[PDB]
Amino acid sequence: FQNSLLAWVPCIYLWVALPCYLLYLRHHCRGYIILSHLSKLKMVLGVLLWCVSWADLFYSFHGLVHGRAPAPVFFVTPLVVGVTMLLATLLIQYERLQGVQSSGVLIIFWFLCVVCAIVPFRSKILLAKAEGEISDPFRFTTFYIHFALVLSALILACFREKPPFFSAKNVDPNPYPETSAGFLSRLFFWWFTKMAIYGYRHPLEEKDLWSLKEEDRSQMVVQQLLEAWRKQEKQTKPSFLKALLATFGSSFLISACFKLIQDLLSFINPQLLSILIRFISNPMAPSWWGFLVAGLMFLCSMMQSLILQHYYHYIFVTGVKFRTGIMGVIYRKALVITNSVKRASTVGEIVNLMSVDAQRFMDLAPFLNLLWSAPLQIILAIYFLWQNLGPSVLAGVAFMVLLIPLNGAVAVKMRAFQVKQMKLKDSRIKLMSEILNGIKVLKLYAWEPSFLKQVEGIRQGELQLLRTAAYLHTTTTFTWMCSPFLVTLITLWVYVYVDPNNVLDAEKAFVSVSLFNILRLPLNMLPQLISNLTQASVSLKRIQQFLSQEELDPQSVERKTISPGYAITIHSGTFTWAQDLPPTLHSLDIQVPKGALVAVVGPVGCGKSSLVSALLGEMEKLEGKVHMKGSVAYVPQQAWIQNCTLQENVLFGKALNPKRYQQTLEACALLADLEMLPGGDQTEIGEKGINLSGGQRQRVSLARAVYSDADIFLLDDPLSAVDSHVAKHIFDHVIGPEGVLAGKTRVLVTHGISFLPQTDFIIVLADGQVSEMGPYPALLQRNGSFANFLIGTVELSVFWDYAKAVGLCTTLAICLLYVGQSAAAIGANVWLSAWTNDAMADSRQNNTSLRLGVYAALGILQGFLVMLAAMAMAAGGIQAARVLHQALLHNKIRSPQSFFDTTPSGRILNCFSKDIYVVDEVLAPVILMLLNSFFNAISTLVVIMASTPLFTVVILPLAVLYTLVQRFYAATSRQLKRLESVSRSPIYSHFSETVTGASVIRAYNRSRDFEIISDTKVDANQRSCYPYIISNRWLSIGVEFVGNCVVLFAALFAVIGRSSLNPGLVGLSVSYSLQVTFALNWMIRMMSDLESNIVAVERVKEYSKTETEAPWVVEGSRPPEGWPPRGEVEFRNYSVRYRPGLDLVLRDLSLHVHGGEKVGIVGRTGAGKSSMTLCLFRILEAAKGEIRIDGLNVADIGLHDLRSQLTIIPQDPILFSGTLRMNLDPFGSYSEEDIWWALELSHLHTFVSSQPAGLDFQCSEGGENLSVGQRQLVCLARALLRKSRILVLDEATAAIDLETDNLIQATIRTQFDTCTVLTIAHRLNTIMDYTRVLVLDKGVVAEFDSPANLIAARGIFYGMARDA
């Protein structure tokens, strides 16, 4: 009694001298004392001094068992001398961050600790060996480890550290706001709030993120990991694992003690719950016991949920440096791997070495501690269950383990139904892409119903396949909602029936419920652990074998010594691409003097590229030596271009000299290319840029080499794909004698001939052996081989649109079917909470059978009302998918052709691809988990208010706080993930190059510059991944504060009303409140996935509203059938426009055409003739005037009763992939004997009759498996299949030979001589045989008469005819 009271004295010194000392530490303002061995070894005497109170504290809790109760303030002292230790070992770490060499407060604090211990020390030592023997060994052997360590800390406290030598300000813009943050505003992540608020009001941009602290930069993590790798390589067993284990494994032990002292801190709270329950069952205990056990119960869950949010802050940051020091030691390897290794792989398979690999190393970081933590708090969380419910928790753990197989078999059965839904979805999207590509022709044959039905036919299969792939989410909401009940049910059923006298009471039931909740989380997240450890040790082997490749940098060329006058000197060398292959170049004796233009020529493949590769060092030199001196400019055969701007490629790491840059552009014949390029020159080139022509690319490479102005110019025939005139001009102004590169050494490798006469010097290779080395005439006269060779949020309207699509008579059957299961769960819990209040003295308390039955058959009802609601939600999700996709199709199909002209077919397809996939198979389970987690946080919070009603008064501000933190978090964590997505891609797009073009980089000795560029591209990703690691901690602090104020109040209001409560409903109210923060984290995760995934359904509903003209059939205004060959198609003041709001394309046009007569439409380009083929077909709806067919107003018919009476031969020949039968009659109303006859008229009969498939011939993606003329014969065959009375031919003589043209015009003349044939053309010779010709000019009719009369009229057609 007289020692515990004394133990408080130092522990009350810190907590009163802290606020008057921390404020002092706001007066140095720059300390940063360096972490030496006297500090990191000093703040670890804190953690052990804490683990020696925990071991002492839980010995008191072992007094509840065995009945022997310690003193009331005898388990409190270990819990206050175990928080000042977590405050000592934190003032040590925070004083170091300031400039406090001698602590002052901490030294006298340790002095107090030792002095306050001496009196208890001198209270047992005189009674230890004098009295006798051990005498309670635990407290006697624990009081010294809190004296040995306190004396060690006192010794290490009165020391003095080195001077701080704090740095300068060193940063003008906004820095990381953790450096220079308070002690409270750093424990609670309060420094992020300034961004969160900001992120709510404005859109975050890369200009707002935080500059990295210096030790986190991209170049200072790869530099430390490189040194470890090199030190490992010196060991002459090169393994990579221990290199980064010795690199980061010291910031991974700082995160393995937070995890420890948070795993140990989470088992206190069940024990305090047991104390509280035992207290309420006793009516004589003073209330301040209850208030003290309800106060500790919150200040022990507010530092178990604070140490955990700081373990995550250090293991996520150490994971952003696993994959930053690895994406930089690979990129530093990609620049030195020999070319054999590069050619024995794929450029895109090494990109995957950090795109796919080396990025799951940041996923394995969080899980790398569950390797020792998850076992630790199973083995421990069972030990506490065992002393509560005895061996009857073998079943409650066996079931929760057995739940891993029967929940991992429903993650590989959800891959059999997840690939079958990917092949089918990709077939559907391929059909959709084929429709969107050619929609013009598919709109104007009135084939819309056929292809629409064909798309619905294979959407039906996908929906039917989701009818069985969404009944495996019924089995993922079971083990999440009905497992917490079923473990309790199995445990209690075994417990009450393994022994008749196992009385079930309040503590046994509810503290063990709490321990089951603890045991749950580390137990269901072993599957992910094994998944990662097995799929991220495959990655490590790939990275290890890549880094253990062969680097070719053996100084293969001496850049120092040459006999004066020569630039290149090869001395009998031999070269091969790889040692296994036979040598490619043998015994080369080459003496290229300075400034000389040497042309290296020979038979095609005689060793031309190999010579340049050897001179650059790319070839493995088997024997010999090469001495080349000077800066080398290299022009590769296949030009390599950065994903950058044409000025930066041509600059290529040189200072912009505009006087010289213009000269290089003019000499390399690039000033011409600066005109027709979109942006001029600053346009991007490459994959995100514009595909330049091959000649343009190789001239860009030549310009890069020329502007580099190096000493030597190695050339690999850059003018292969360049026109002769351009090639000769380039040779004159750049390469040849009069060119700029006159005083510089040159080397030429070529297949050509015309450059040899202008050459200064020529070397002839002979199968890897130099044959002749002489000038052009000397070699020519010898008759050698040379002679022979010559952003906001979503409104309620979106959710109501989704609910209406699902069916608001099925949205009800879900939102009042979780209410039923919520009520059944509350009822089962209340029934248990009345079973634990057994008849405290009565023999007839033998209704264990009844009490167990009305609990089993009432938690089961809570099962059959979540499967019956998960199934209803799955059915509603697939119904919404079907309805929304049906609307999307039936709208975009009927959309006017103007919408397709405006919008590119790429923006259309993503909606059918990525805005429906989200609607189809990620919204259904996100809704389901948001409903799972909302009806767990509501039952939990209405079983508390039902027991202690006063508690309700605190739920109004703890809901304002929770919704406020969600509104502020989701509005920022949404922008940081978008902002991270747009910056993760450039790293890989930059690693794509520097692998393909590492030879060019090395040639301009430009490897350091590219390392710098990769560092600043990894660092821009890293500036946006450091937030979103802290917006998730500033959230989990504002959610584990709401979830721990509920813990405080559910106990405070249960001690306040202790006279009406009983040991039962308080155990429920309290133990069922510890996991109110596990359902508030899930309801924050899902409420923000949902808020972002649901913009897509309002996009799908936005694009389903675009205006359309959709009278396919009127069925009430049907024109008379049996259409006659009257052909009396007459315009009447007709006027049309492509775009609503533009000028009149055809103004006041008027004509009358009799049946069968041939009328031709000709004119200048842009006269609107094309749109004329679109005005009879009502593609562009009649604006002014009208159009009449046989005296009938066309504007009064269903569109598919208009277009199904007119036939054309459309401009673009489109063949939709499938059988050739489909491409001739999609509606399938044509007999097969007529089809073949049409193929004889089409003159395509020979092809189809010869082919084995015949009527089932397969077609590729739009007529690339068929020649052009075959495509036009297919169109003509469609025409003969239709054979209406009106035909509108469309200019089919543009890019085909005459023979096909002969066939098509002959068939038109013969077969359709009984039809009204309208024809448009630019080739008048096609229409010279037509009876009458119509000529349009400026959208108004000018001449309309016979070809002879129009020629006789001396008109525009007469002038146009002379032009042909």
Short mmCIF file of N, CA, C and O in Angstrom, two decimals, residues 1255-1349:
data_model
loop_
_atom_site.label_atom_id
_atom_site.label_comp_id
_atom_site.label_asym_id
_atom_site.label_seq_id
_atom_site.Cartn_x
_atom_site.Cartn_y
_atom_site.Cartn_z
N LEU A 1255 -20.69 -19.78 -98.15
CA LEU A 1255 -21.63 -18.86 -97.50
C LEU A 1255 -21.28 -18.60 -96.04
O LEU A 1255 -21.96 -17.79 -95.40
N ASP A 1256 -20.27 -19.28 -95.50
CA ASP A 1256 -19.84 -19.08 -94.12
C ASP A 1256 -18.41 -18.54 -94.07
O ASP A 1256 -17.70 -18.75 -93.08
N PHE A 1257 -17.99 -17.85 -95.12
CA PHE A 1257 -16.65 -17.28 -95.17
C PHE A 1257 -16.46 -16.28 -94.04
O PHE A 1257 -17.32 -15.42 -93.81
N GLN A 1258 -15.34 -16.38 -93.34
CA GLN A 1258 -15.07 -15.52 -92.20
C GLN A 1258 -14.47 -14.20 -92.67
O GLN A 1258 -13.65 -14.17 -93.59
N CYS A 1259 -14.88 -13.11 -92.03
CA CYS A 1259 -14.44 -11.77 -92.38
C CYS A 1259 -13.67 -11.16 -91.22
O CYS A 1259 -14.03 -11.35 -90.06
N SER A 1260 -12.62 -10.42 -91.55
CA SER A 1260 -11.77 -9.79 -90.54
C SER A 1260 -12.42 -8.50 -90.06
O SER A 1260 -13.58 -8.21 -90.36
N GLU A 1261 -11.67 -7.69 -89.31
CA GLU A 1261 -12.20 -6.47 -88.70
C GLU A 1261 -12.27 -5.37 -89.76
O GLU A 1261 -11.43 -4.46 -89.82
N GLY A 1262 -13.29 -5.45 -90.60
CA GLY A 1262 -13.56 -4.40 -91.56
C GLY A 1262 -12.77 -4.46 -92.85
O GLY A 1262 -12.05 -3.52 -93.20
N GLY A 1263 -12.89 -5.58 -93.57
CA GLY A 1263 -12.38 -5.68 -94.92
C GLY A 1263 -10.89 -5.50 -95.12
O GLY A 1263 -10.47 -4.78 -96.03
N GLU A 1264 -10.07 -6.13 -94.27
CA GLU A 1264 -8.64 -6.22 -94.53
C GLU A 1264 -8.19 -7.62 -94.94
O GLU A 1264 -7.07 -7.77 -95.43
N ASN A 1265 -9.03 -8.63 -94.76
CA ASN A 1265 -8.79 -9.95 -95.32
C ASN A 1265 -9.29 -10.07 -96.76
O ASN A 1265 -9.13 -11.12 -97.37
N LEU A 1266 -9.89 -9.01 -97.29
CA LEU A 1266 -10.37 -8.96 -98.67
C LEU A 1266 -9.77 -7.76 -99.37
O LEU A 1266 -9.58 -6.70 -98.76
N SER A 1267 -9.48 -7.92 -100.66
CA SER A 1267 -8.97 -6.81 -101.45
C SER A 1267 -10.04 -5.73 -101.60
O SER A 1267 -11.22 -5.94 -101.31
N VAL A 1268 -9.62 -4.56 -102.07
CA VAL A 1268 -10.53 -3.43 -102.22
C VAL A 1268 -11.66 -3.79 -103.17
O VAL A 1268 -12.85 -3.75 -102.81
N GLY A 1269 -11.30 -4.17 -104.40
CA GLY A 1269 -12.31 -4.50 -105.39
C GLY A 1269 -13.27 -5.57 -104.91
O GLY A 1269 -14.45 -5.55 -105.25
N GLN A 1270 -12.78 -6.51 -104.10
CA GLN A 1270 -13.68 -7.48 -103.49
C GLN A 1270 -14.69 -6.80 -102.57
O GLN A 1270 -15.86 -7.18 -102.54
N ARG A 1271 -14.25 -5.78 -101.83
CA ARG A 1271 -15.17 -5.05 -100.97
C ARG A 1271 -16.24 -4.33 -101.79
O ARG A 1271 -17.43 -4.36 -101.44
N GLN A 1272 -15.84 -3.68 -102.88
CA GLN A 1272 -16.86 -3.02 -103.70
C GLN A 1272 -17.78 -4.02 -104.38
O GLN A 1272 -18.96 -3.73 -104.58
N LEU A 1273 -17.28 -5.20 -104.75
CA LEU A 1273 -18.18 -6.24 -105.25
C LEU A 1273 -19.12 -6.74 -104.17
O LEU A 1273 -20.25 -7.12 -104.48
N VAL A 1274 -18.69 -6.75 -102.91
CA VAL A 1274 -19.61 -7.09 -101.83
C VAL A 1274 -20.72 -6.05 -101.72
O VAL A 1274 -21.90 -6.39 -101.55
N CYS A 1275 -20.36 -4.77 -101.80
CA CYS A 1275 -21.37 -3.71 -101.78
C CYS A 1275 -22.34 -3.86 -102.95
O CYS A 1275 -23.56 -3.76 -102.79
N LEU A 1276 -21.80 -4.10 -104.15
CA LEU A 1276 -22.62 -4.29 -105.34
C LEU A 1276 -23.50 -5.53 -105.21
O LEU A 1276 -24.63 -5.56 -105.74
N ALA A 1277 -23.03 -6.56 -104.51
CA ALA A 1277 -23.84 -7.75 -104.28
C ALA A 1277 -24.98 -7.46 -103.32
O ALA A 1277 -26.10 -7.94 -103.52
N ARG A 1278 -24.72 -6.67 -102.27
CA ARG A 1278 -25.81 -6.17 -101.44
C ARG A 1278 -26.84 -5.44 -102.29
O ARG A 1278 -28.05 -5.61 -102.11
N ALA A 1279 -26.36 -4.61 -103.22
CA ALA A 1279 -27.26 -3.85 -104.08
C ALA A 1279 -28.15 -4.78 -104.90
O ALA A 1279 -29.38 -4.63 -104.91
N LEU A 1280 -27.55 -5.74 -105.60
CA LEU A 1280 -28.35 -6.70 -106.38
C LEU A 1280 -29.28 -7.51 -105.49
O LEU A 1280 -30.37 -7.89 -105.94
N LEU A 1281 -28.88 -7.78 -104.25
CA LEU A 1281 -29.78 -8.47 -103.34
C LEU A 1281 -31.00 -7.61 -103.01
O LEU A 1281 -32.11 -8.12 -102.88
N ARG A 1282 -30.80 -6.30 -102.88
CA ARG A 1282 -31.92 -5.42 -102.59
C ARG A 1282 -32.80 -5.23 -103.82
O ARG A 1282 -33.98 -5.60 -103.82
N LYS A 1283 -32.23 -4.67 -104.89
CA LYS A 1283 -32.90 -4.50 -106.18
C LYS A 1283 -34.24 -3.78 -105.99
O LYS A 1283 -35.33 -4.34 -106.15
N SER A 1284 -34.14 -2.53 -105.57
CA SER A 1284 -35.30 -1.66 -105.48
C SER A 1284 -35.47 -0.93 -106.81
O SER A 1284 -34.77 -1.21 -107.79
N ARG A 1285 -36.40 0.02 -106.87
CA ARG A 1285 -36.61 0.80 -108.07
C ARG A 1285 -35.78 2.07 -108.12
O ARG A 1285 -35.68 2.69 -109.18
N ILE A 1286 -35.17 2.47 -107.00
CA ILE A 1286 -34.33 3.66 -106.94
C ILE A 1286 -32.95 3.24 -106.46
O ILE A 1286 -32.83 2.55 -105.45
N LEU A 1287 -31.92 3.66 -107.19
CA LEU A 1287 -30.54 3.39 -106.81
C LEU A 1287 -29.76 4.69 -106.89
O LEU A 1287 -29.89 5.45 -107.85
N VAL A 1288 -28.95 4.95 -105.87
CA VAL A 1288 -28.16 6.18 -105.77
C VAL A 1288 -26.70 5.76 -105.67
O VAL A 1288 -26.17 5.56 -104.58
N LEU A 1289 -26.03 5.65 -106.81
CA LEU A 1289 -24.64 5.21 -106.80
C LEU A 1289 -23.75 6.31 -106.24
O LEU A 1289 -24.01 7.50 -106.45
N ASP A 1290 -22.70 5.92 -105.52
CA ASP A 1290 -21.85 6.86 -104.80
C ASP A 1290 -20.39 6.68 -105.23
O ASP A 1290 -19.63 5.98 -104.56
N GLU A 1291 -20.04 7.31 -106.35
CA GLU A 1291 -18.65 7.63 -106.72
C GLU A 1291 -17.68 6.49 -106.44
O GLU A 1291 -16.73 6.62 -105.66
N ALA A 1292 -17.92 5.35 -107.09
CA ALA A 1292 -17.16 4.13 -106.84
C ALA A 1292 -15.96 3.97 -107.77
O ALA A 1292 -15.44 2.85 -107.89
N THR A 1293 -15.49 5.04 -108.41
CA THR A 1293 -14.37 4.94 -109.34
C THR A 1293 -13.21 5.84 -108.91
O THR A 1293 -12.63 6.54 -109.75
N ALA A 1294 -12.86 5.82 -107.63
CA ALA A 1294 -11.86 6.75 -107.11
C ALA A 1294 -10.49 6.12 -106.93
O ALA A 1294 -9.49 6.73 -107.33
N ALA A 1295 -10.40 4.93 -106.34
CA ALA A 1295 -9.11 4.34 -105.99
C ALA A 1295 -9.06 2.87 -106.37
O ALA A 1295 -8.49 2.04 -105.66
N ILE A 1296 -9.67 2.52 -107.51
CA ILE A 1296 -9.70 1.14 -107.97
C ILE A 1296 -9.26 1.11 -109.43
O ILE A 1296 -9.34 2.11 -110.15
N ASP A 1297 -8.80 -0.06 -109.87
CA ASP A 1297 -8.42 -0.24 -111.26
C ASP A 1297 -9.66 -0.20 -112.16
O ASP A 1297 -10.80 -0.28 -111.70
N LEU A 1298 -9.41 -0.08 -113.46
CA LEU A 1298 -10.51 0.02 -114.42
C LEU A 1298 -11.29 -1.29 -114.53
O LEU A 1298 -12.50 -1.26 -114.76
N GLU A 1299 -10.62 -2.44 -114.37
CA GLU A 1299 -11.29 -3.72 -114.54
C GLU A 1299 -12.44 -3.88 -113.55
O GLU A 1299 -13.56 -4.24 -113.94
N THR A 1300 -12.18 -3.61 -112.27
CA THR A 1300 -13.27 -3.57 -111.30
C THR A 1300 -14.27 -2.48 -111.65
O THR A 1300 -15.49 -2.67 -111.54
N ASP A 1301 -13.77 -1.31 -112.07
CA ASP A 1301 -14.65 -0.25 -112.53
C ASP A 1301 -15.46 -0.69 -113.74
O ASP A 1301 -16.66 -0.40 -113.84
N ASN A 1302 -14.81 -1.38 -114.69
CA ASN A 1302 -15.54 -1.91 -115.83
C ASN A 1302 -16.68 -2.81 -115.37
O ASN A 1302 -17.82 -2.68 -115.82
N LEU A 1303 -16.38 -3.71 -114.43
CA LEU A 1303 -17.39 -4.65 -113.94
C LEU A 1303 -18.56 -3.91 -113.29
O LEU A 1303 -19.72 -4.21 -113.57
N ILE A 1304 -18.26 -2.93 -112.44
CA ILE A 1304 -19.34 -2.29 -111.68
C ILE A 1304 -20.21 -1.43 -112.60
O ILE A 1304 -21.44 -1.49 -112.52
N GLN A 1305 -19.59 -0.64 -113.48
CA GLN A 1305 -20.41 0.15 -114.40
C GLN A 1305 -21.19 -0.74 -115.37
O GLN A 1305 -22.34 -0.44 -115.69
N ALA A 1306 -20.58 -1.83 -115.85
CA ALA A 1306 -21.32 -2.73 -116.74
C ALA A 1306 -22.51 -3.35 -116.04
O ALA A 1306 -23.61 -3.43 -116.61
N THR A 1307 -22.33 -3.78 -114.79
CA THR A 1307 -23.43 -4.36 -114.03
C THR A 1307 -24.52 -3.33 -113.77
O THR A 1307 -25.71 -3.64 -113.85
N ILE A 1308 -24.13 -2.09 -113.46
CA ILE A 1308 -25.12 -1.04 -113.23
C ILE A 1308 -25.91 -0.78 -114.51
O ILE A 1308 -27.14 -0.64 -114.47
N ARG A 1309 -25.22 -0.70 -115.64
CA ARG A 1309 -25.90 -0.45 -116.91
C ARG A 1309 -26.86 -1.57 -117.26
O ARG A 1309 -27.98 -1.32 -117.73
N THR A 1310 -26.45 -2.82 -117.04
CA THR A 1310 -27.27 -3.96 -117.47
C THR A 1310 -28.39 -4.27 -116.48
O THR A 1310 -29.57 -4.21 -116.83
N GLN A 1311 -28.03 -4.60 -115.24
CA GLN A 1311 -29.00 -5.09 -114.27
C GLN A 1311 -30.05 -4.04 -113.93
O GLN A 1311 -31.24 -4.37 -113.82
N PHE A 1312 -29.65 -2.79 -113.75
CA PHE A 1312 -30.53 -1.75 -113.23
C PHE A 1312 -30.99 -0.79 -114.31
O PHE A 1312 -31.19 0.40 -114.05
N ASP A 1313 -31.15 -1.28 -115.54
CA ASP A 1313 -31.70 -0.45 -116.60
C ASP A 1313 -33.18 -0.16 -116.41
O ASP A 1313 -33.72 0.73 -117.08
N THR A 1314 -33.85 -0.87 -115.50
CA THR A 1314 -35.26 -0.65 -115.20
C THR A 1314 -35.46 0.12 -113.90
O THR A 1314 -36.56 0.07 -113.33
N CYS A 1315 -34.44 0.81 -113.42
CA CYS A 1315 -34.48 1.50 -112.15
C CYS A 1315 -34.07 2.96 -112.34
O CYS A 1315 -33.28 3.28 -113.23
N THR A 1316 -34.60 3.83 -111.49
CA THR A 1316 -34.17 5.22 -111.44
C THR A 1316 -32.81 5.27 -110.76
O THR A 1316 -32.70 4.94 -109.57
N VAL A 1317 -31.79 5.68 -111.49
CA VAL A 1317 -30.41 5.59 -111.02
C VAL A 1317 -29.86 7.00 -110.88
O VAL A 1317 -29.60 7.68 -111.88
N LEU A 1318 -29.69 7.44 -109.64
CA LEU A 1318 -29.00 8.69 -109.34
C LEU A 1318 -27.54 8.38 -109.06
O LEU A 1318 -27.21 7.42 -108.37
N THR A 1319 -26.65 9.19 -109.63
CA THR A 1319 -25.22 8.93 -109.52
C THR A 1319 -24.48 10.22 -109.20
O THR A 1319 -24.74 11.27 -109.80
N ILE A 1320 -23.55 10.14 -108.25
CA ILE A 1320 -22.63 11.23 -107.96
C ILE A 1320 -21.24 10.78 -108.38
O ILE A 1320 -20.89 9.60 -108.27
N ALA A 1321 -20.44 11.73 -108.87
CA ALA A 1321 -19.10 11.40 -109.31
C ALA A 1321 -18.27 12.67 -109.44
O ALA A 1321 -18.80 13.78 -109.51
N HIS A 1322 -16.95 12.48 -109.45
CA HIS A 1322 -16.02 13.50 -109.89
C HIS A 1322 -15.38 13.15 -111.23
O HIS A 1322 -14.76 14.03 -111.85
N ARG A 1323 -15.51 11.91 -111.68
CA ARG A 1323 -15.00 11.47 -112.97
C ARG A 1323 -16.16 11.49 -113.96
O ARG A 1323 -17.07 10.66 -113.89
N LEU A 1324 -16.13 12.46 -114.88
CA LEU A 1324 -17.24 12.64 -115.81
C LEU A 1324 -17.34 11.49 -116.81
O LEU A 1324 -18.45 11.13 -117.24
N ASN A 1325 -16.21 10.88 -117.17
CA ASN A 1325 -16.23 9.76 -118.10
C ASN A 1325 -17.11 8.62 -117.60
O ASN A 1325 -17.61 7.82 -118.40
N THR A 1326 -17.30 8.52 -116.29
CA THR A 1326 -18.24 7.55 -115.74
C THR A 1326 -19.67 7.87 -116.15
O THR A 1326 -20.47 6.96 -116.42
N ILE A 1327 -20.02 9.16 -116.20
CA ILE A 1327 -21.40 9.58 -116.42
C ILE A 1327 -21.68 10.02 -117.86
O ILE A 1327 -22.83 10.40 -118.15
N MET A 1328 -20.69 9.98 -118.75
CA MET A 1328 -20.90 10.44 -120.12
C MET A 1328 -22.00 9.69 -120.87
O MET A 1328 -22.54 10.22 -121.84
N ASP A 1329 -22.35 8.48 -120.45
CA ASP A 1329 -23.42 7.76 -121.13
C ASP A 1329 -24.79 8.01 -120.51
O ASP A 1329 -25.80 7.53 -121.05
N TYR A 1330 -24.86 8.75 -119.40
CA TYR A 1330 -26.14 8.99 -118.75
C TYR A 1330 -27.00 9.95 -119.57
O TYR A 1330 -26.49 10.82 -120.29
N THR A 1331 -28.32 9.79 -119.45
CA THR A 1331 -29.24 10.61 -120.23
C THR A 1331 -29.16 12.08 -119.83
O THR A 1331 -29.00 12.96 -120.68
N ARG A 1332 -29.28 12.36 -118.53
CA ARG A 1332 -29.30 13.72 -118.03
C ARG A 1332 -28.29 13.87 -116.91
O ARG A 1332 -28.01 12.93 -116.18
N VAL A 1333 -27.73 15.07 -116.80
CA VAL A 1333 -26.70 15.37 -115.81
C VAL A 1333 -27.13 16.59 -115.00
O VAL A 1333 -27.59 17.59 -115.57
N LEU A 1334 -26.99 16.50 -113.68
CA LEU A 1334 -27.30 17.59 -112.77
C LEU A 1334 -26.00 18.11 -112.17
O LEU A 1334 -25.22 17.32 -111.61
N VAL A 1335 -25.76 19.41 -112.28
CA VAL A 1335 -24.55 20.05 -111.78
C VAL A 1335 -24.95 21.05 -110.70
O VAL A 1335 -25.77 21.94 -110.95
N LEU A 1336 -24.36 20.90 -109.52
CA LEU A 1336 -24.58 21.83 -108.42
C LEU A 1336 -23.37 22.75 -108.26
O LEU A 1336 -22.23 22.35 -108.49
N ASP A 1337 -23.65 23.98 -107.86
CA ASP A 1337 -22.59 24.95 -107.59
C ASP A 1337 -23.07 25.90 -106.50
O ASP A 1337 -24.14 26.51 -106.64
N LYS A 1338 -22.29 26.01 -105.43
CA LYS A 1338 -22.60 26.89 -104.30
C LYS A 1338 -23.96 26.57 -103.70
O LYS A 1338 -24.70 27.45 -103.26
N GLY A 1339 -24.30 25.28 -103.68
CA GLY A 1339 -25.53 24.85 -103.04
C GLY A 1339 -26.80 25.20 -103.77
O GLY A 1339 -27.89 25.07 -103.21
N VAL A 1340 -26.70 25.64 -105.02
CA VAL A 1340 -27.86 25.97 -105.84
C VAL A 1340 -27.68 25.33 -107.21
O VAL A 1340 -26.56 25.25 -107.73
N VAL A 1341 -28.79 24.84 -107.77
CA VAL A 1341 -28.74 24.25 -109.10
C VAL A 1341 -28.35 25.32 -110.12
O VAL A 1341 -28.85 26.45 -110.09
N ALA A 1342 -27.42 24.97 -111.00
CA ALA A 1342 -26.99 25.85 -112.08
C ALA A 1342 -27.34 25.29 -113.45
O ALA A 1342 -28.00 25.96 -114.25
N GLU A 1343 -26.91 24.06 -113.74
CA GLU A 1343 -27.22 23.39 -115.00
C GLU A 1343 -27.76 22.00 -114.70
O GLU A 1343 -27.24 21.31 -113.83
N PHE A 1344 -28.81 21.61 -115.43
CA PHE A 1344 -29.39 20.27 -115.28
C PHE A 1344 -29.94 19.87 -116.66
O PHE A 1344 -31.08 20.19 -116.99
N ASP A 1345 -29.13 19.15 -117.42
CA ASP A 1345 -29.49 18.76 -118.78
C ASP A 1345 -28.62 17.58 -119.20
O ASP A 1345 -27.86 17.03 -118.40
N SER A 1346 -28.76 17.19 -120.47
CA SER A 1346 -28.02 16.06 -121.00
C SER A 1346 -26.53 16.40 -121.13
O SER A 1346 -26.17 17.58 -121.24
N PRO A 1347 -25.66 15.39 -121.12
CA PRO A 1347 -24.23 15.67 -121.32
C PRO A 1347 -23.93 16.36 -122.64
O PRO A 1347 -23.06 17.23 -122.70
N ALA A 1348 -24.65 15.99 -123.70
CA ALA A 1348 -24.46 16.65 -124.98
C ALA A 1348 -24.95 18.09 -124.93
O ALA A 1348 -24.26 19.01 -125.40
N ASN A 1349 -26.13 18.31 -124.36
CA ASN A 1349 -26.66 19.67 -124.26
C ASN A 1349 -25.80 20.53 -123.35
O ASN A 1349 -25.55 21.71 -123.65
#
